[PDB]
Design an enzyme around this catalytic site. Structure first.
Site, mmCIF file in Angstrom:
data_model
loop_
_atom_site.group_PDB
_atom_site.id
_atom_site.type_symbol
_atom_site.label_atom_id
_atom_site.label_comp_id
_atom_site.label_asym_id
_atom_site.label_seq_id
_atom_site.Cartn_x
_atom_site.Cartn_y
_atom_site.Cartn_z
ATOM 1 N N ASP A 85 -1.132 -3.456 -14.433
ATOM 2 C CA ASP A 85 0.144 -3.073 -13.784
ATOM 3 C C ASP A 85 0.498 -4.040 -12.666
ATOM 4 O O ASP A 85 0.986 -3.603 -11.624
ATOM 5 C CB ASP A 85 0.079 -1.642 -13.251
ATOM 6 C CG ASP A 85 1.422 -1.064 -12.840
ATOM 7 O OD1 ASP A 85 2.477 -1.591 -13.267
ATOM 8 O OD2 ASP A 85 1.400 -0.082 -12.103
ATOM 9 N N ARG B 96 5.575 -4.922 -6.456
ATOM 10 C CA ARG B 96 5.442 -3.614 -5.782
ATOM 11 C C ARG B 96 3.984 -3.265 -5.514
ATOM 12 O O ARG B 96 3.765 -2.434 -4.613
ATOM 13 C CB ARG B 96 6.139 -2.498 -6.566
ATOM 14 C CG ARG B 96 5.584 -2.245 -7.951
ATOM 15 C CD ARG B 96 6.226 -1.093 -8.704
ATOM 16 N NE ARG B 96 5.652 -1.112 -10.053
ATOM 17 C CZ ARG B 96 6.071 -1.839 -11.095
ATOM 18 N NH1 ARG B 96 7.169 -2.578 -11.075
ATOM 19 N NH2 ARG B 96 5.385 -1.815 -12.211
ATOM 20 N N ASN B 97 3.014 -3.837 -6.221
ATOM 21 C CA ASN B 97 1.583 -3.460 -6.233
ATOM 22 C C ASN B 97 0.738 -4.501 -5.489
ATOM 23 O O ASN B 97 -0.489 -4.340 -5.472
ATOM 24 C CB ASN B 97 1.111 -3.235 -7.678
ATOM 25 C CG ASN B 97 1.755 -2.002 -8.281
ATOM 26 O OD1 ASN B 97 1.986 -1.023 -7.574
ATOM 27 N ND2 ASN B 97 2.109 -2.062 -9.552
ATOM 28 N N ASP C 34 -4.840 -2.077 -6.288
ATOM 29 C CA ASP C 34 -4.778 -0.966 -7.279
ATOM 30 C C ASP C 34 -5.040 -1.486 -8.695
ATOM 31 O O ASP C 34 -4.716 -0.796 -9.672
ATOM 32 C CB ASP C 34 -3.444 -0.225 -7.173
ATOM 33 C CG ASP C 34 -3.336 0.640 -5.924
ATOM 34 O OD1 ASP C 34 -4.289 0.629 -5.107
ATOM 35 O OD2 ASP C 34 -2.296 1.307 -5.779
HETATM 36 C C1 LIG Z 1 6.872 -1.405 -2.192
HETATM 37 C C2 LIG Z 1 7.881 -1.764 -3.156
HETATM 38 C C3 LIG Z 1 6.176 -0.536 -1.809
HETATM 39 C C4 LIG Z 1 5.301 0.176 -0.911
HETATM 40 O O1 LIG Z 1 5.004 -0.429 0.106
HETATM 41 N N1 LIG Z 1 4.812 1.391 -1.221
HETATM 42 C C5 LIG Z 1 3.902 2.118 -0.342
HETATM 43 C C6 LIG Z 1 3.713 3.544 -0.832
HETATM 44 C C7 LIG Z 1 2.724 4.250 0.060
HETATM 45 C C8 LIG Z 1 1.412 3.518 0.089
HETATM 46 N N2 LIG Z 1 1.557 2.107 0.453
HETATM 47 C C9 LIG Z 1 0.495 1.395 1.002
HETATM 48 C C10 LIG Z 1 -0.715 1.377 0.322
HETATM 49 F F1 LIG Z 1 -0.872 2.100 -0.810
HETATM 50 C C11 LIG Z 1 -1.806 0.700 0.806
HETATM 51 C C12 LIG Z 1 -1.735 -0.040 1.974
HETATM 52 C C13 LIG Z 1 -2.897 -0.780 2.547
HETATM 53 N N3 LIG Z 1 -3.988 -0.966 1.802
HETATM 54 O O2 LIG Z 1 -2.834 -1.155 3.722
HETATM 55 C C14 LIG Z 1 -0.505 -0.075 2.645
HETATM 56 N N4 LIG Z 1 -0.147 -0.709 3.809
HETATM 57 C C15 LIG Z 1 1.170 -0.424 4.089
HETATM 58 C C16 LIG Z 1 1.794 -0.944 5.343
HETATM 59 C C17 LIG Z 1 1.680 0.396 3.125
HETATM 60 C C18 LIG Z 1 3.075 0.931 3.088
HETATM 61 C C19 LIG Z 1 0.625 0.632 2.175
HETATM 62 C C20 LIG Z 1 2.571 1.364 -0.274
#
Ligand SMILES: */C(C)=C\C(=O)N[C@H]1CCCN(c2c(F)cc(C(N)=O)c3[nH]c(C)c(C)c23)C1
Ligand SMILES: [Cl-]
Length: 259
Positions: free
Chosen positions: A127, A131-132, A145
């Site tokens: 994936d 976004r990931n 992920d």
């Molecule tokens: C983008 C298109 C997306 C996005 O940032 N989504 C968020 C959704 C909530 C979780 N998020 C997330 C994460 F899963 C992990 C980390 C990390 N390992 O630090 C993370 N840092 C930030 C600042 C966010 C928003 C994070 C992604």
């Protein structure tokens, strides 16, 4: 391995991830962490916890650091390092005024280097997309992920959230995931980076994309992509997986272009 749940203090919600709520936390009163909250019935836990031992060993500077899990009660915690600038897609969409081609290439290089490490360990992301990936305070991009969609139990109803627009034809036709389908997705990510976060195949729904990609349609060259960079992303999109480069080859191809 297994972490002590009370050695994690939850501080604030980062948002709703693909796999549940994600919290900013502190580990051992010292380390900034992200904590994915995994609800009962959402994951093939047996399979995941086997792979959680794999996740722990698959450490690289361009992969988000995996610290461990809290697996003895619900929600399950998946604990990773905190990466302060969040997802690459939203970073691109909010920093485009200041981003220049050399920095955009470095973002692609970072992802490619993490993916070359995964490929060398026969580990399939499944994936990959802007976004990931996550962006740290120094603009280093890290792959996040990787592999996690494999253990999701919920029917994706392939309306669907299934990522057709990042999917090689053998994925949308046969659901055949490989490092070469990751290469296709990497090319799409390169397009997301050089387009400063545009949506691929923006005017088209998933059914239109399956037909158009099957018929040879490919994403246009972003304005900020040189011909050489476009040829790299385009090489990722051969109909046949065996005609696509490996991540080792892509990394080789990008290295001489860095400034
Ligand atoms: C983008 C298109 C997306 C996005 O940032 N989504 C968020 C959704 C909530 C979780 N998020 C997330 C994460 F899963 C992990 C980390 C990390 N390992 O630090 C993370 N840092 C930030 C600042 C966010 C928003 C994070 C992604
Ligand atoms: Cl563009």
């Amino acid at each position: 391995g297994e972490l002590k749940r009370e050695e994690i203090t939850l501080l604030k919600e980062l948002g709703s991830g693909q796999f549940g709520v994600v919290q900013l936390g502190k580990w051992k009163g010292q380390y900034d962490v992200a904590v994915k909250m995994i609800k009962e019935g959402s994951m093939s836990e047996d399979e995941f916890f086997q792979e959680a031992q794999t996740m722990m060993k698959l450490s690289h500077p361009k992969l988000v650091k995996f610290y461990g899990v809290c697996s003895k009660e619900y929600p399950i915690y998946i604990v990773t390092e905190y990466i302060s600038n969040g997802c690459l897609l939203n970073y691109l969409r909010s920093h485009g005024k200041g981003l220049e081609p050399s920095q955009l290439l470095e973002m692609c290089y970072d992802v490619c280097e993490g993916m070359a490490f995964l490929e060398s360990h026969q580990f399939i992301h499944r994936d990959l997309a802007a976004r990931n990936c996550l962006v740290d305070r120094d603009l280093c991009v890290k792959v996040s992920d990787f592999g996690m969609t494999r253990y999701v139990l919920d029917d994706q109803y392939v309306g669907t959230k299934f990522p057709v627009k990042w999917s090689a034809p053998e994925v949308f036709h046969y659901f055949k995931y490989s490092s070469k389908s990751d290469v296709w997705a990497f090319g799409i990510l390169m397009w997301e980076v050089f387009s400063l976060g545009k949506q691929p195949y923006d005017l088209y729904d998933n059914s239109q994309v399956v037909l158009k990609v099957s018929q040879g349609h490919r994403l246009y060259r972003p304005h900020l992509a040189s011909d050489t960079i476009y040829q790299i992303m385009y090489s990722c999109w051969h109909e046949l997986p065996e005609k696509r480069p490996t991540f080792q080859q892509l990394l080789s191809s990008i290295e001489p272009l860095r400034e």
